[PDB]
Design a binder for this molecule. Structure first.
Ligand SMILES: *[C@@](C)(CO)[C@](*)(O)[C@H](CC(C)C)NC(=O)[C@H](Cc1ccccc1)NC(=O)[C@H](CC(C)C)NC(=O)[C@H](CCc1ccccc1)NC(=O)CN1CCOCC1
Ligand SMILES: *[C@@](C)(CO)[C@](*)(O)[C@H](CC(C)C)NC(=O)[C@H](Cc1ccccc1)NC(=O)[C@H](CC(C)C)NC(=O)[C@H](CCc1ccccc1)NC(=O)CN1CCOCC1
Ligand SMILES: *[C@@](C)(CO)[C@](*)(O)[C@H](CC(C)C)NC(=O)[C@H](Cc1ccccc1)NC(=O)[C@H](CC(C)C)NC(=O)[C@H](CCc1ccccc1)NC(=O)CN1CCOCC1
Ligand SMILES: [Cl-]
Ligand SMILES: [Mg+2]
Ligand SMILES: [Mg+2]
Lengths: 125, 196, 222, 233, 222, 204, 195, 212, 195
């Protein structure tokens, strides 16, 4: 297996691969989250250099993880699908073992844990 | 067991080891497997000690009753009585018997009666677990009309080898000589036969 | 077909006092109707004031004791020479036994010593690791003979106060080390009389705060 | 899961005041067939230990090779291999005992009963038994197979407990062992007359005796025994 | 069981241990395994306890009737023949293993009988679970032309070997000496080398310890 | 399907100074199910007492059989049967069924009216007599009873002391056996008086 | 055949027996009377192997009726129960034993007392205040241990019996189709039609 | 073993015996068949002693790890399912366990789950488990009402174990009582059958089958 | 686990499943729901080996729910039944197979048709107008062969189902403690509370 440590520390104490991953997020289309008194609203930018698009079938920016939780993102679109899939699987697995749907904090903690794992695992960015 | 009976010029000689086993334990190392059913009709016993004793006792009874009415029975007659018991009760018996006797008319005769209860008249016979190891030797060395001393040496050498290779055979080599002269018992000890 | 188990016979006995505990066991080792040894000890000092015996199939018994002794050694290495308490030892042994749940150690295990309050403690285990603290336990071939006698004499079962119309029970009290050793010796002589796998010698290990003492007594050799 | 094919019978042994004695016949049986007659079942390790083995001979030969390799391995990077760091009987036994129990625990045993006899560096007698189940025990007298049933009773009349060991000389001890081998020849159907005997003494060292024979046997009374009950002739 | 028989100058001696087992439990510590078939024909029995007693009493009964019918003292070969034909008929299901010995007008005799009905002749014999231990002693110390006192010593030593080394045998040594021209002497408990040591404690309970629900006088009279 | 341990139960007998004691539990069950707590296992024919453990149908059958036989005995002999004689009768009767036996563990107890000697005896299911000076035990807790008797017993106990020893032997043995207990009865037997006592024990 | 219960009260014996006859996966009948009158004051219920049950019950019935005609006299419940036990005790060592378990409820006219005997196919007899055969006992015995009193009336006994049937209908796996209840007292045997 | 637990107006009653057997040999009369997982969770034990003892203490460890990770006490449903999913992994291996997970949480209220070694997991108001379960059911069902008082409910649980202790040969020793409320579990003592039986017989007037 | 029935009518699928959970000689529960909702318009009932039944049902449920979230779309009953069959078809050649028999009742929203699939533990799938697993079928199939019509209403289907349960309650040996009835139609899944 490919083992290379891609995410590593630099002299100044920075992990450039993680910081360059943030630059990819900074490039991505804007996404905003605002929570009210009895609701949450997720707003998302879609760049208008793409005309002749088919909005019926084009992947939506906001994704349902379960019937009660949603996930939007900014950055690499292909990368997001992997996190969304893993989150959706964990959501069903939680319902199966705990007999109760995930809390938003738990689902976040899971997704965040996956992201962290890819910052100190060999062979992955 | 290792047993055998060999006809020769003057009559017949019966031979046997003296070992009785329970598994690998030797319950009796000085057993007498050569048994009298009549004055000059004897047998070699192999297989179940209980079965062969029970059979021999019944045959002895039959031949004694035969003698009271019809006089001395033939060796063939004795073999027939053994056969009748072994054949008709084949399902409940484990007995390999060699019948050997001396008539004045018929001289020395040997009949062997294996597990099935069949009868086989032969010049000589070998039987018992240890006999397997001396088929080759006995076939090569047996001759008809041997002398007494030659027959004794034949039986001694044969049973010596059977004893050497068979764990179920051992102890002393007993022999019984049947001739017109009478009945002679012979015994041979390990120190003699082992170093043959 | 190969049978990986055997029966080495013998019997063991643990009694707990107020400030002491004893673990006794006969020294006879057998297979079928044969005696292998008249003096083969199966009660061991395992350190930290814990005595142990694993009676039944001696090969499994020796393996278990050996593994527990080793567990005590590594407990010191990993936890700054901390003393392994009898309750912690008991739980550790459960995991050793249950670790082989699907190919069990064929033994009845008993350990004895002092708890963390300095009081006498006896723990007993089944072959697959279920355990319980008790004042009293007999294990092995003659356990069925000795145990009911212990119920009667140590825990005073079925004994009522004379003249109270079977209403007031005989009150529970701790026994002295002298009285306990009398019961152990009488238990083993009685078991020797009526059980063929029990005899030859009796070895008792007594545990107090001062340490582990030994006593040996002859038993009938028939 | 095995079944033993070519087998060796009893190994017998006992302690005496200065050391230990061990003996075993030279037979390799093949069921009831007494197949092989030149089989050495006592194997010395160094000049202070003798391992007597009964049961499956193919597994015995495997154990021989292990002991042989143990001596080689012990010599590696060991300037004191023939002195302070030489192989002890207790080391050799524990090694075998470990192997026997590991093999039984894998359900593939070495189909043997083993007695390790020797003398430790401090002069103490070593005598201990181990078998296919990994069961171990020690006693002033030890025997395997039929030896356990017939030899032990005779050897225990000489050394019945620990205190009898200093009172037992090598002459008395060897006499009992040789007597026991005769009794086994009378009564064990898978035994032979030829045997080997080894003495490990703390003073005189290892004495290995080959090509011994059972002798002074009583067979004369057999001639008087006739029939199985009534028969007079 | 361990039982033996030893021939000597002017007769024959038989001996036996006195342990009766029930699995690993000693049921009777002092049972009598030496049986009287006739005044001067005695029998040592091993195997199934009820069978040895039943078969020896039956043949003993028929021997007595035979003795009265023929106006003669009974012979050992008659007991031997009757026992073996009975045992053979039952194909080993009657688990009686017997050493038959005695004196009669023909002389002194020693035989063994097995459950399936086979018989053996000898100067020294041993049967039972401790027969190998006993036979080891007999093979080591037996010789031709034993005296009465030497044969008793050899027989009891052979039983002792069973007592100490065989778990199936224990307790005491019974002996019966059958000498020619003399009455047979039955030596019940000839040796008692397994006496129970004094108990450490008396377990005599204070009167009223046991709780009682009812009392009543039972009528045994008419 | 082991006949001797379907119904459960125990009997124990002891000798004392010029007296004998015989005791039994009261349980009759069907394996785990306790059915009856009144099932006595001790019977008597004149002054001879018989306890019987094992398969309950055979306990009942044998009682009826020995009552039958001892009644005819008395009519012909013109006297009561003695313990020594009865012991032989029990042995004969059991061995008569050698290859189809009653699954029982009988125990005879009594005092010979002529000699005054205390007598006890035990049997296996096919009639082997086990005579004893001290005690006889029988039933599903026989191991337990052997252990209790061997430690608690001492010779020449007075009837009142003997009662305590035999009772404690039975009770503590029964409490270590699942199939024994549910009440108990103790018979104290002197030369010409017999006392019967029901014991208080745990009912589980 | 499955459920047979018996309760002895102050002045009567009450027998309850299930009505179902099942073979395979089919309830062939739901009104089966699993009892025979042995005499005017003696009733026997039965359960066990198919065929054996009725064959045995009627065989006993015939024998008791024969006795009654011969002596012009009714055998006591104790006497009948001893006769039945002996037959079963013979049977268990036969070539093919009767695999039948019975309860015998009777009223002894000489003693003026109700009597309930429980006898299994081995010939194991016991007199009881309340009895059951088969798996029923695993529920009813503990229930009766709690609620039963020796001085109860026939009506109290029937309510006690209803409590047993309700528990069995709740926890038993099989549908036994209710029970036929019969009462045995000084006036003989009668059937409760509405249960 | 006989164990039970039932739900009622005032929460949950849990009652167990204390006997342990090895065939017909009574090995112990003082076994603890209730495991105190946490102040709001109990577990009952029936079947293989080691299997029950080992895996239910393991369950307690898993329930502790839950509240460390989630900063919240585990639900009775989630606790019981950890155990049921565990024994299901071992299905066919020969585990012998008959358990009941009894407890209280805010979201669930008082809850009882039956969980056994062949994978069965059932929520319910009343369960009796063990070889003596039927004897306990007989007394419990015939006297059970939802509106029982805490005092009467405690007694019925105790009396039901006593009934089984008496009739079933493999049950006995002593009765251990627990009461589970919104504030957690409360221990209500060890009651020896040796004294309890006669006390109940005399005061209640029951057990007329026994010689008084 | 024992009785599960299914009837497809004109505009709906009706599933009936027994409420009893029995272990040994004890009915542990009499209100057990032997079904799981796989999707808003698809319901699966199940019966078979203890533990396996629920473990399998919930495993399928999780997978179908995962699919629904991923695609924001409900799988057709045909698609779900094929998925379930394949899982069982894999299972039967595993080390330890799922011993579970299922009925899948669903309403296809694209076709506007009710659909009933019967799948056994071997992975044997069939689409049927009416179905049953276990011994139930030995009574209900012949009954439905006679009384069933393809154009029946939901109410007629429930009366037809009552006729099945009555027959089972009459002739079945075991007490299955009645049934929970659920209806699957264009409006989704609902439970009949009074049956
Ligand atoms: C050689 C040994 C083999 O060919 C000889 O043939 C001798 C013949 C002499 C005795 C006439 N045979 C034996 O020694 C004979 C071998 C034997 C064994 C079993 C069946 C057939 C042949 N040995 C015996 O008969 C002994 C005699 C006793 C020791 C005095 N008997 C047994 O071993 C009995 C026999 C039971 C039996 C089995 C099958 C058919 C008939 C009878 N067997 C045992 O006692 C079993 N043994 C008991 C202890 O548990 C281990 C097995
Ligand atoms: C040594 C000690 C053993 O080899 C001796 O051989 C002695 C011989 C002397 C006593 C004559 N043998 C025994 O002690 C003998 C050993 C034995 C055991 C089992 C089978 C064969 C041999 N012991 C017995 O025979 C005892 C005698 C009693 C204890 C006094 N009997 C039992 O153990 C009986 C076995 C009876 C039996 C029936 C059918 C075939 C063979 C044997 N067992 C029981 O009573 C067990 N059971 C308990 C519950 O109630 C029903 C009976
Ligand atoms: C009632 C009593 C009905 O069983 C309860 O269910 C209790 C439950 C409590 C203790 C949790 N159950 C038991 O007592 C239980 C019954 C049982 C036995 C065996 C299998 C399943 C259930 N008893 C045990 O588990 C005992 C407990 C010991 C005595 C403390 N243990 C054994 O019987 C053990 C080990 C069983 C075992 C399981 C799996 C693999 C291997 C072994 N066996 C022994 O101790 C063996 N033997 C007993 C007699 O002496 C010689 C050694
Ligand atoms: Cl012979
Ligand atoms: Mg001994
Ligand atoms: Mg109980």
């Amino acid at each position: 297996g490919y083992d290379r440590a891609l995410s590593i520390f630099s002299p100044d104490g920075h992990i450039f691969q993680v910081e360059y991953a943030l630059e990819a997020v900074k490039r991505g289309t804007c996404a905003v989250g605002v929570k009210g008194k009895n609701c949450v609203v997720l707003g998302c930018e879609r760049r208008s250099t793409l005309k002749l698009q088919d909005t019926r079938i084009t992947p939506s920016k906001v994704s349902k993880i379960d019937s009660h939780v949603v996930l939007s993102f900014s950055g690499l679109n292909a990368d997001s699908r992997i996190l969304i899939e893993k989150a959706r699987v964990e959501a069903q697995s939680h319902r199966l073992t705990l007999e109760d749907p995930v809390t938003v904090e738990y689902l976040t903690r899971y997704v965040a844990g996956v992201q962290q794992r890819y910052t100190q695992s060999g062979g992955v960015r | 067991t290792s047993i055998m009976a060999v006809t020769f010029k003057d009559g017949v000689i019966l031979g046997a080891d003296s070992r009785t086993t329970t598994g690998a334990y030797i319950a009796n190392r000085v057993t007498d497997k050569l048994t009298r059913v009549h004055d000059k009709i004897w047998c070699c016993r192999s297989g179940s000690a209980a079965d062969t004793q029970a059979i021999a006792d019944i045959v002895q009874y039959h031949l004694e009753l035969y003698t009271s009415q019809y006089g001395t029975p033939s060796t063939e007659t004795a073999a027939s009585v053994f056969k009748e018991l072994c054949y008709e009760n084949k399902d409940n018996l484990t007995a390999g018997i060699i019948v050997a006797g001396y008539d004045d008319k018929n001289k020395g005769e040997v009949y062997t009666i294996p597990l099935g209860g069949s009868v086989h008249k032969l010049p000589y016979a070998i039987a018992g677990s240890g006999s397997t190891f001396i088929y080759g030797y006995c076939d090569k060395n047996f001759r008809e009309n041997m002398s007494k001393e030659e027959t004794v040496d034949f039986i001694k050498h044969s049973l010596s080898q059977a004893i050497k290779w068979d764990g179920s055979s051992g102890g002393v080599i007993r022999m019984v000589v049947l001739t017109a002269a009478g009945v002679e018992r012979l015994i041979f000890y390990p120190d003699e036969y082992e170093q043959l | 077909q190969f049978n990986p188990y055997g029966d080495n016979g013998g019997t063991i006995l643990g009694i707990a006092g107020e400030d002491f505990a004893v673990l006794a066991g006969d020294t006879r080792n057998i297979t079928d109707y044969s005696i292998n040894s008249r003096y083969e000890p199966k009660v061991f000092d395992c350190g930290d004031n814990i005595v142990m015996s694993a009676n039944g199939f001696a090969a499994d018994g020796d393996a278990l004791v050996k593994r527990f002794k080793n567990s005590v050694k590594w407990y010191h290495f990993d936890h700054n020479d901390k003393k392994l308490s009898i309750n912690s030892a008991a739980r550790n042994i459960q995991h050793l036994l249950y670790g082989k749940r699907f190919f069990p150690y064929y033994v009845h295990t008993i350990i004895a010593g002092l708890d963390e309050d300095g009081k006498g403690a006896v723990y007993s285990f089944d072959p697959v690791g279920s355990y319980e603290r008790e004042q009293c336990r007999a294990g092995g071939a003659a356990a069925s003979l000795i145990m009911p006698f212990l119920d009667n004499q140590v825990n005073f079962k079925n004994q009522y106060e004379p003249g109270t119309n079977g209403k007031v029970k005989k009150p529970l009290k701790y026994l002295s080390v002298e009285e306990v050793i009398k019961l152990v010796r009488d238990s083993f002589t009685s078991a020797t009389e009526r059980h063929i796998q029990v005899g030859d010698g009796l070895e008792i290990l007594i545990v107090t705060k001062d340490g582990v003492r030994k006593e040996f007594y002859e038993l009938k050799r028939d | 899961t095995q079944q033993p094919i070519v087998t060796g019978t009893s190994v017998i042994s006992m302690k005496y005041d200065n050391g230990v004695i061990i003996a075993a016949d030279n037979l390799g049986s093949y069921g009831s067939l007494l197949r092989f007659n030149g089989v050495e079942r006592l194997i010395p390790v160094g000049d202070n230990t003798v391992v007597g083995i009964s049961g499956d001979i193919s597994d015995m030969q495997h154990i021989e090779r292990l002991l042989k390799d143990l001596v080689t391995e012990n010599a590696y990077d060991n300037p004191l291999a023939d002195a302070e760091e030489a192989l002890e009987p207790s080391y050799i036994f524990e090694y075998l005992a470990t192997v026997m129990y590991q093999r039984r625990s894998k359900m593939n045993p070495l189909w043997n009963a083993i007695i390790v006899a020797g003398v430790q560096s401090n002069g103490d007698q070593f005598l201990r038994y181990v078998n296919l189940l990994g069961v171990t025990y020690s006693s002033p007298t030890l025997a395997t197979g039929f030896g356990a049933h017939m030899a032990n009773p005779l050897l225990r009349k000489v050394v019945d407990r620990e205190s009898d060991i200093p009172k037992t000389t090598v002459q008395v001890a060897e006499e009992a062992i040789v007597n026991a081998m005769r009794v086994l020849y009378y009564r064990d159907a898978r035994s032979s007359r030829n045997f080997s005997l080894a003495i490990i003494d703390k003073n005189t060292g290892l004495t290995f005796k080959k090509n011994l024979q059972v002798e002074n046997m009583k067979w004369d009374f057999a001639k008087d025994i006739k029939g199985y009950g009534t028969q007079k002739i | 069981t361990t039982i033996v028989g030893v021939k000597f100058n002017n007769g024959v001696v038989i001996a036996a241990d006195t342990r009766s087992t029930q699995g690993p439990i000693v049921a009777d510590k002092n049972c009598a395994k030496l049986h009287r078939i006739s005044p001067k024909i005695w029998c040592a029995g091993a195997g199934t306890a009820a069978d040895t007693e039943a078969v020896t009493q039956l043949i003993g009964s028929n021997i007595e009737l035979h003795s009265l019918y023929t106006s003669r003292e009974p012979r050992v070969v008659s007991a031997l023949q009757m026992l073996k034909q009975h045992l053979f008929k039952y194909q080993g299901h009657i688990g009686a293993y017997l050493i038959v010995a005695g004196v009669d007008p023909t002389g002194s005799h020693l035989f063994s009988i097995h459950a399936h009905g086979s018989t053996d002749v000898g100067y020294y014999l041993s049967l039972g679970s401790g027969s190998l231990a006993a036979m080891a002693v007999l093979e080591s110390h037996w010789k031709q032309d034993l005296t009465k006192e030497e044969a008793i010593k050899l027989a009891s030593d052979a039983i002792q070997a069973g007592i100490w080394n065989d778990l199936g045998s224990g307790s005491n040594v019974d002996v019966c000496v059958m000498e020619i021209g003399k009455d047979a002497e039955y030596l019940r408990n000839y040796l008692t080398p397994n006496v129970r040591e004094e108990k450490q404690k008396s377990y005599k309970f204070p009167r009223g310890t046991t709780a009682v629900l009812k009392e009543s006088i039972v009528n045994i009279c008419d | 399907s082991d006949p001797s341990s379907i119904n459960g139960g125990i009997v124990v007998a002891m000798t004392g100074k010029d007296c004998v004691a015989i005791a039994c539990d009261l349980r009759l069950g069907s394996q785990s199910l306790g059915v009856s707590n009144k099932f006595e296992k001790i019977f008597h024919y004149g002054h001879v007492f018989l306890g019987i453990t094992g398969l309950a149908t055979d306990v009942t059958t044998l009682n009826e059989m020995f009552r039958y036989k001892t009644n005819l005995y008395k009519l012909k002999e013109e006297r009561a049967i003695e313990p020594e004689t009865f012991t032989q009768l029990v042995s004969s009767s059991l061995y008569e069924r050698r290859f189809g036996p009653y699954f029982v563990g009988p125990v005879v107890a009594g005092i010979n009216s002529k000699s005054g000697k205390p007598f006890i005896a035990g049997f296996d299911l096919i009639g082997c007599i086990d005579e004893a000076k001290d005690f006889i035990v029988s039933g599903t807790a026989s191991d337990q009873l052997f252990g209790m008797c061997e430690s608690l017993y001492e010779p020449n106990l007075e009837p009142e002391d003997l009662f305590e020893t035999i009772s404690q032997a039975l009770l503590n043995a029964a409490d270590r056996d699942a199939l024994s207990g549910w009440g108990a009865v103790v018979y104290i037997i002197k030369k010409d008086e017999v006392v019967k006592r029901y014991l208080k024990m745990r009912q589980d | 055949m499955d459920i047979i219960l018996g309760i002895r009260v102050q002045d009567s014996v009450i027998l309850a027996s299930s009505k179902a006859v099942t073979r395979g996966i089919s309830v062939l009948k739901d009104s089966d009377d699993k009892t025979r009158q042995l005499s005017p004051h003696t009733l026997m219920s039965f359960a066990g192997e198919a065929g054996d049950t009725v064959q045995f019950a009627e065989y006993i019935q015939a024998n008791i009726q024969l006795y009654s005609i011969r002596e012009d006299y009714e055998l006591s419940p104790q006497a009948v129960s001893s006769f039945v036990r002996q037959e079963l005790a013979k049977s268990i060592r036969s070539r093919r034993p009767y695999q039948v378990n019975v309860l015998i409820g009777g009223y002894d006219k000489k003693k003026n007392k109700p009597e309930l005997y429980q006898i299994d196919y081995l010939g194991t007899k016991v007199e009881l205040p309340y009895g059951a055969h088969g798996y029923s006992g695993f529920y009813t015995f503990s229930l009766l241990d709690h609620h039963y009193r020796p001085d109860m009336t026939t009506e109290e006994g029937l309510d006690l019996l209803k409590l047993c049937v309700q528990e069995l209908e709740k926890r038993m796996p099989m549908d036994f189709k209710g029970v036929i209840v019969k009462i045995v007292d000084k006036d003989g045997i009668r059937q409760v039609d509405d249960f | 073993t006989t164990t039970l637990a039932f739900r009622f107006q005032g929460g949950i009653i849990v009652a167990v015996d204390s006997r342990a057997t090895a065939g017909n040999w009574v090995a112990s009369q003082t076994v603890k068949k209730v495991i105190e997982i946490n102040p709001f969770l109990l577990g009952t034990m029936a079947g293989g002693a080691a299997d029950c003892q080992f895996w239910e203490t393991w369950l307690g460890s898993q329930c502790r790890l839950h509240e460390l990770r989630e900063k919240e006490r585990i639900s009775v449903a989630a606790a019981s399912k950890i155990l049921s999913n565990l024994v299901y992994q071992y299905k066919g291996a020969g585990l012998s366990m008959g358990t009941m997970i009894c407890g209280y949480t805010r979201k669930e209220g008082p809850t009882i789950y039956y969980v056994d070694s062949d994978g069965t997991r059932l929520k319910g108001d009343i369960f009796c488990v063990g070889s003596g379960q039927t004897f306990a059911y007989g007394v419990l069902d015939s006297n059970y009402k939802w509106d029982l008082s805490v005092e009467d409910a405690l007694y019925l649980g105790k009396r039901s174990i006593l009934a089984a202790a008496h009739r079933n040969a493999y049950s006995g020793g002593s009765v251990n009582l627990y009461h589970v409320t919104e504030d957690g579990w409360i221990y209500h003592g060890n009651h020896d059958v040796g004294e309890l039986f006669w006390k109940v017989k005399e005061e209640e007037g029951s057990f007329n089958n026994v010689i008084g």
